[PDB]
Amino acid sequence: EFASSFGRPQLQTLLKDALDQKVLDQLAARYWNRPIEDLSPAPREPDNIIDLPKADPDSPYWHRQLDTACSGLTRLGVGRLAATVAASAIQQHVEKLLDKSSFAKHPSARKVISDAAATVLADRSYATSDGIEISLKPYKFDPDIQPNEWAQGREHVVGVLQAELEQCQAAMKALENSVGGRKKLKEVMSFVDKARKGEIIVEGDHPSGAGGFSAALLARGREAVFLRDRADILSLRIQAAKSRQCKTLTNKYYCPEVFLDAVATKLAQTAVLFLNVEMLNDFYVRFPREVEAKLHEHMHAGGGLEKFAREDPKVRRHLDLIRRKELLETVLGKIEELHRISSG
Amino acid sequence: IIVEGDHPSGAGGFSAALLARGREAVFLRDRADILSLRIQAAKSRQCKT
Amino acid sequence: MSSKLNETTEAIQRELEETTYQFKVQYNEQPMSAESYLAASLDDFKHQFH
């Protein structure tokens, strides 16, 4: 029944989640702001994300940035990622089925079953990974995006991005209330902005008190500035992903979020097809034979049959009742045999 | 409240300098009150005799 | 030496394997030589000049 239940779109969601966080990592590392550690001016990068909608379309910086972002996403072990994710998933589902099954007790038999599933998946893992990289070989070169795929990526990016924003804003406001007044954290933020510009200098690796702020309050102010900049960037990229300019597919370099999400979805689905065939069906075919062989060998080789019986409370009372009855019957049999061997 | 510092850098968000300014402020406050109190005492009826 | 030979051999096979995997996933096992790069780029330049 489980094998009839699992199927392939489940593998689709499983792969798409791992690749979703792959997208967030690549996009954030290529486009968004980096953390503040000290109170020195940060080296100012010439191009900024706030001026992306109003940027020259033939920009070598933005082109190189989106291109190295996408090539980094594609030339990753997506074959090995899909194979290991599907492996852990199938094994987990077998473990849950085991939880609901009659083998809740008997950890020996249960572990025999689990280890059987594990060894089958381990046997097939390599063929699935290499086959997935071969089948993805054309989409590594040109993951050409269709307008509907672009629309799907558009709808998905809004949700992924706003979840990131909500966590960010909740953390900011909690920071304000923890430090004290909103206006007080605004004061430390103004001071850290001042030291980040040329307006003021502190010359400390560990600044204790400057402008009246503690060594901890400075840390809280830097954290506040980072959260601010990341929140503004995130909201701006959400409004851009909802922008009119990102609805069309031709502005691929102008909408890195939507493009990278589209590539993620595509690689996930075509890798998922070969994954289902090469791995999933192989599991459904090999698993029962392996279970039967290993369980039978376990009971009869290890003597775990009798312990398997001893383990459950109801069946222990059942078989114990049967045993004492057996001893008495055999005693009567010995007496009846005695009467036969000796006429009188 | 406790600070656990022999030289506290940042506590409650206050700088090593701001703590110094606050201690100086408290010392000046207490000394001002003591001084005005002793002035009220020197003008008191009990110091006339 | 002969005793360590087995473990060392398997480890060398391992470091060879991961070098091979990266050669498969990132460059598609495409052969490359300096002369090939130079010749291809020269012809690209000559297409540009033509």
Side-chain angles (χ1 to χ4, degrees), chain A residues 154-166:
Chain A
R154 189 175 184 272
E155 267 210 3
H156 199 217
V157 160
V158 174
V160 182
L161 248 47
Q162 189 142 6
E164 183 82 32
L165 172 67
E166 287 179 1

Side-chain angles (χ1 to χ4, degrees), chain A residues 179 206-217, chain B residues 7-19:
Chain A
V179 170
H206 190 80
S208 170
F213 304 169
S214 65
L217 240 184
Chain B
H7 169 70
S9 166
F14 295 172
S15 57
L18 244 186
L19 271 313

Side-chain angles (χ1 to χ4, degrees), chain A residues 231-335:
Chain A
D232 296 336
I233 293 174
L234 275 173
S235 53
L236 233 287
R237 297 318 299 177
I238 294 176
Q239 188 172 54
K242 302 182 165 187
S243 163
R244 175 186 294 116
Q245 83 162 136
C246 284
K247 243 180 180 179
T248 180
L249 160 280
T250 52
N251 311 322
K252 134 194 164 76
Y253 293 100
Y254 281 178
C255 312
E257 292 80 20
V258 184
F259 179 88
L260 287 193
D261 198 313
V263 176
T265 301
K266 184 179 287 209
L267 299 173
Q269 77 194 7
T270 152
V272 125
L273 222 76
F274 189 91
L275 215 184
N276 157 272
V277 173
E278 185 74 32
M279 176 165 286
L280 199 71
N281 271 239
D282 186 287
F283 184 77
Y284 293 159
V285 296
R286 273 179 194 172
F287 185 50
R289 345 281 158 271
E290 189 66 23
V291 166
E292 291 180 292
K294 275 296 186 176
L295 269 191
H296 192 104
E297 183 212 52
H298 167 61
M299 300 308 192
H300 301 1
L305 181 266
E306 293 102 2
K307 151 68 177 29
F308 174 91
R310 287 183 126 86
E311 203 159 20
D312 187 281
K314 284 179 169 295
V315 313
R316 181 176 268 263
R317 295 174 248 162
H318 204 174
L319 300 160
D320 287 6
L321 194 58
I322 293 182
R323 83 134 282 183
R324 157 166 168 181
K325 176 186 167 156
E326 212 149 295
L327 267 252
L328 294 179
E329 294 167 326
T330 49
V331 158
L332 261 70
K334 285 310 187 71
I335 296 189

